[PDB]
Symmetry: D2
Subunit: 325 residues, 4 copies
């Protein structure tokens, strides 16, 4: 009768433990085990039959592509089992959007995959982790949650991995998608589903990574007044396969950036022009080098580019991925 | 009886001219002269006695610190004159926030300095430039506008240079300060002032650049999964005096970024940890390298750092600037 | 080869004509004919074969349910024709959300129905109507726009009738759905679809009004400190069939409001508890009188209640409508 | 050395106590005493010397003007004492904005007055009250907090009573001022002040209520399609002295509402046209009846109108209050 949910722990402030109730820096993110998290919210056991698995225990600023690859592989294994109805992944907030979007493109199942995180450590006064986890378990176990793509659940909100981003350095309500909104919200112990994303993901995605053991190198370069050509030269010299440009406005580029991007393209590096602004569409512009990010922000664009480079070097195909995923 | 306003033109989509009413890319930003702008909104002449001056005519993605320095010097000259009551600066949207914040720190006058820009070119259907300019002139000529710091006026809103940022690649309403709001709004031909910024600026600022002819080099490095050490090495090798880090979450840093920042500090480079998120406070953390950006986003933080480096290398002094400016 | 679009005009500031370019009040909304609108944006004729029809010419604050009923009936007639591919409805901004939501529930077609409006009159400097109309025609004629429910298009954004609301009295960017986002955006002459609404509408809706000639009376009462019982007594005395309560917080009710709501229910009036806050979920609460609005704001809740009352008085059925529509 | 702070308790979900950790409705708001609140966050005693006083213990939907009057009188008494450095007022979230704005206009002291509330009850998993109270005490005890007007503190944010409103029925981040932002934020145990409000308040306000024992009656009427004249007739018949109209768009009014407003003005009732939209400016319009609310939302506008009516019936004076307070 209860759903079977695996809580797969990777680390984060959600598993952080500090010396006092108001310590906000200098505590170890990813100190507490997945069973400690579970045991602090015994209410979870009335929503699902939960099993904890300790995948890693790191702060998400140290999450790396090779590890995210393994996480995606393990989640694909789990969801292929009949005794697993969904998976909740505990993660740090800083790079959750990157990890979640990676799994959104690579998990070949319609069963729910819900990332959860906490802006305050577990020891903190008014810690948000307990309720965030409870909400994430509720979402992962609900039959209505299937086929929605990978989700990110904090602060009563259910965000699509493709749209959601950490918008604020430090607040509980940081995760928002200003232009695209939330997939749903959790209020009064009930899920209210609002939207389905109109993009390819999960079971309809071409991005299979089950045979892979590493990913193509992609760096992100910022756009600003006086931005230097030499950062493009260094990226090329170090063997990047892609550069994502966090551009000025709508992916616009200085004379120096144009020179860098042209040098990159000459050396077989794919350039995606995204925006530093935080939101909105980078439109095509045939007068400029590179491809355009559609509404993907720089961190998301890097994840799609990395995966696109496992399949193709055809700029028409990559550009179409950015308009469809 | 009318205020005397100088319209000082630098370029931008506000002075853009395209082949049709819906062409959104591949037109020259900064094609039209300041007198063409003025002549399209003759209504401006009922609000002020206006004089146009063509300072530059470039797209703002190509605006550089050396030029912004000269702009600040020229605006300081103008505002010292009794026949100038305020100045409106037409600029591209992409880097307006950078130029405006520079002048906010360096213009030693309480007379209004209002940057204005347009998201659609002058030729576009429903072009926003005409009304934005009219509003900017109204603001610059109003006696109530004095002593407010440098302002950015688009879409009926008056933003402080210290808070306002381009939040969306492509929309008319892009300029917002999500946490700090607008200084005021212009509705029905009337200015409604809401807030005064609680920060140092203009006449209370230490940042004098009247004797300067160049600025210290500062680059911006992004924070993301797998971010590389080699970009810090390249920046150091190329003689940066500062690095602003657009960090993961609240200026958090990977093992690789920490190694880079430590190398930079060892070579006499000041590091400021800002955030890629778009909003909010990077708090102090003595366990991490560098100084923290307070609520300055990466583009603003670069401008303050550059100016701070003209005066000092004392990290206590620079850190205090970031909490006060 | 071009789509066939009917532009059905009802009035609004989009068809407003004032004496000068900055007159913001005291002009007649709905002065200009639909052919004048069309002739100001001849670009529309490259996107569709357009035909204008003058349905009404009023300011939307004077739009009434009886007229909205007829509008829905006429749109159902039009969309049943093979020579009509979609319909764009020009309307005032003040009550567009009400009219649009009514049609969202009652138009039995998957062909696009796009409401469009303008915050500045047609004569205004930087009038937004021309571009809003062009965007609305583009949306209505696109094959990808089918089956999305009724849409509201201003300022480069495509809002669902069920979520979108006028959030600001006076700004061009007023239409937003803070929690649910936009269905899509129009940038660079291209439509970017983001979301499909996860609610019943149009072809899946039970709300048929083709045989009807009037609608049940529903009033809206506000919630605030010292709110009076006597307004409930007056509404009952005047024969309301429903009351929507724009409640304090999450539909919460004073001792006086509870007395009023109980009196209403005793006299056969259905009460829906909504919120004055502007956003979010009113959860069920069996300790309080009436039904709950889910995330419907007061204006939308009134439209659903009115339609629900044409079909049923069963509070279980009405409550389920509020969770599904 | 520590500041002396009085915690003056009125009730609310902050003092709510439910049977389980996830019960969201049907619990008594204002069950717990002020000493229970204090004893749950002993950390408060390291920030201030605190004394609790139980002013009332009600749910804020039942807060009434007569009681808010007494609260303002008591806070004025407290702040006149040398042994009180500031006051924190615990209150329900639903009408906090009304009570806080009343005190903003009537407390004749520059010492901090900080309202605090909680969206989750004290018993709830991840209850927000403890941290909100700690933050409110920090704000009230800080010397930099003086002369800022009355503040509302939840979720790491410090809102001005004049701008802040509950924007969402049910979320922790509900309190926002979309156009005006926050006065400050509290992150990492530190206050970051961003703005000072550019409006009259507290020590510069004319609104003295120290001799008063009751307030003029003011009701709020909503604006919508088919809005009825009879609600104006009932309000007049019941002796209102003011009506605030939560208007369609920018305070716009139907033919029926105009008839009602004219009848009200004929009987000596002052009408203020506000907006139901949630934000922005209602501009003057001499073609319409009544005065305009500037950017005051309906709940705030009622509080100012009530106080304005204790002093004057001169519409020029009242209109100027709405532009200055
Ligand atoms: N640095 C932490 C921040 C958080 O979890 O809130 C992490 O991302 O692991
Ligand atoms: N690239 C243009 C964009 C704009 O002005 O909207 C500029 O910044 O010059
Ligand atoms: N009162 C006008 C406002 C607008 O269209 O902007 C209307 O709703 O008809
Ligand atoms: N109804 C409660 C809601 C809250 O405090 O959150 C109150 O306002 O008293």
């Amino acid at each position: 009768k209860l759903p079977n949910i695996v809580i797969l722990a990777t680390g984060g402030t959600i598993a952080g433990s500090a010396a006092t109730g108001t310590q906000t820096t200098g505590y170890k993110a990813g100190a507490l085990g997945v069973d400690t998290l579970i045991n602090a919210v015994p209410e979870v056991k009335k929503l699902a039959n939960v099993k904890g698995e300790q995948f890693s225990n790191m702060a998400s600023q140290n999450m790396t592509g090779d590890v995210v690859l393994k996480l995606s592989q393990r989640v694909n294994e789990l969801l292929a089992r009949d005794d697993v109805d969904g998976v909740v992944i505990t993660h740090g907030t800083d790079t959750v959007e990157e990890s979640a979007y990676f799994l959104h493109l690579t998990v070949k199942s319609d069963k729910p995959v819900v990332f959860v995180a906490a802006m305050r450590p577990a020891t903190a006064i008014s810690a948000d982790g307990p309720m965030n986890l409870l909400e994430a378990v509720r979402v992962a176990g609900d039959k209505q949650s299937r086929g929605r793509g990978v989700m990110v659940v904090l602060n009563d909100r259910i965000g699509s991995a493709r749209y959601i981003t950490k918008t604020n350095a430090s607040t509980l309500d940081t995760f928002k998608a200003n232009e695209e909104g939330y997939l749903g919200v959790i209020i009064g112990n009930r899920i209210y589903y609002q939207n389905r994303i109109d993009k390819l993901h999960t079971t309809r995605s071409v991005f299979d990574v089950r045979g892979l053991t590493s990913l193509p190198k992609v760096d992100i370069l910022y756009g600003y007044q006086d931005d230097p050509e030499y950062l493009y030269d260094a990226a090329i010299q170090h063997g990047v396969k892609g550069i994502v440009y966090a551009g000025m406005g709508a992916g616009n580029v200085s004379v120096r950036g144009i020179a860098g991007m042209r040098k990159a393209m000459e050396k077989g590096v794919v350039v995606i022009r995204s925006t530093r602004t935080g939101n909105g569409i980078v439109p095509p512009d045939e007068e400029l080098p590179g491809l355009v990010s559609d509404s993907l922000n720089p961190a998301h664009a890097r994840i799609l580019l990395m995966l696109a480079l496992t399949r193709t070097s055809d700029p028409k195909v990559i550009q179409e991925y950015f308009h469809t995923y």
